[PDB]
Amino acid sequence: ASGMIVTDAGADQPIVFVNRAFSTITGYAPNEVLGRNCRFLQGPQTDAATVARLREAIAAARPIQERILNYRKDGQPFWNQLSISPVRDETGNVVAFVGVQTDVT
Amino acid sequence: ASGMIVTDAGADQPIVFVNRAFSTITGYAPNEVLGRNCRFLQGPQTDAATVARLREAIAAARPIQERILNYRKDGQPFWNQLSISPVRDETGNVVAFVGVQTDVT
Numbered sequence: 001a002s003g004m005i006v007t008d009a010g011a012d013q014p015i016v017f018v019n020r021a022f023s024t025i026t027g028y029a030p031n032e033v034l035g036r037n038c039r040f041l042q043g044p045q046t047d048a049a050t051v052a053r054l055r056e057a058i059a060a061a062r063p064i065q066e067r068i069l070n071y072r073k074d075g076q077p078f079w080n081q082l083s084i085s086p087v088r089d090e091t092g093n094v095v096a097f098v099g100v101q102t103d104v105t
Numbered sequence: 106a107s108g109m110i111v112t113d114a115g116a117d118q119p120i121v122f123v124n125r126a127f128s129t130i131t132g133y134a135p136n137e138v139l140g141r142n143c144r145f146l147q148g149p150q151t152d153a154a155t156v157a158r159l160r161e162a163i164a165a166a167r168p169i170q171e172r173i174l175n176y177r178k179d180g181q182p183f184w185n186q187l188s189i190s191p192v193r194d195e196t197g198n199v200v201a202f203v204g205v206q207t208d209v210t
């Protein structure tokens with residue numbers, strides 16, 4: 001099952017909702033992640049270039065897909081097939097971002 | 106600000122998250138809508154053909170936009186500029202739906 005994260009659009013994109021599969025994949029409970037930027041999932045072997053591409057896409061509110069190395073709460077690495085998209089209203093304002101995670105280890 | 110509703114994908118698409126502006130627009134608090142299908146927003150003058158189009162799009166996981174008559178908690182009608190999209194994983198599985206409202210009354 002794939003994880004889902006919803007973040008606010010502004011102000012460094014704090015998490016506002018996660019589904020159950022997010023906890024299955026990452027080992028974090030909702031309480032442990034709400035209000036935080038998702039970058040706590042990264043760690044020392046995460047590819048910096050990939051991170052850069054995410055950062056640039058989010059700042060532009062452009063959809064992006066990447067395979068990124070992430071880490072469970074306990075420190076166990078896993079490969080995340082990650083897809084992020086803005087949620088826009090019909091005037092084009094970005095209301096949120098949604099990300100989908102699949103553990104492809 | 107535009108409302109946002111996230112639902113599960115299956116069964117009857119129960120609401121799992123709403124943003125602040127959903128409460129502004131509709132008068133409902135999160136605790137009174139979570140776990141319900143969004144159709145409680147409809148009422149006597151809602152156009153049945155519009156509802157039917159939403160029903161078929163959700164069943165097929167197709168994006169759709171409609172201007173639909175909805176009702177606030179206090180019973181006041183409002184025009185909801187509604188857009189719905191599925192959230193998919195990279196294999197195409199539907200993870201959730203996202204709806205965006207704008208009160209265009």
Ligand SMILES: Cc1cc2nc3c(=O)[nH]c(=O)nc-3n(C[C@H](O)[C@H](O)[C@H](O)COP(=O)(O)O)c2cc1C
Pocket residue numbers: 005006007013037038039041042051052054055058068070080082084097098099100101
């Ligand atoms: C909706 C959404 C979901 C995200 N999911 C993840 C994720 O699962 N794993 C991850 O490493 N980064 C994820 N990110 C990316 C980070 O939050 C962050 O944007 C990225 O590391 C680049 O920014 P930075 O250089 O400021 O950290 C997500 C971002 C958003 C907006």
Ligand SMILES: Cc1cc2nc3c(=O)[nH]c(=O)nc-3n(C[C@H](O)[C@H](O)[C@H](O)COP(=O)(O)O)c2cc1C
Pocket residue numbers: 110111112118142143144146147156157159160163173175185187189202203204205206
């Ligand atoms: C994510 C999402 C958001 C929705 N938002 C609304 C809404 O704001 N107003 C509305 O009248 N129906 C909304 N709907 C549609 C109803 O939940 C329902 O699908 C529609 O009435 C058709 O199905 P029915 O004939 O079984 O009621 C939403 C559905 C989804 C999945």
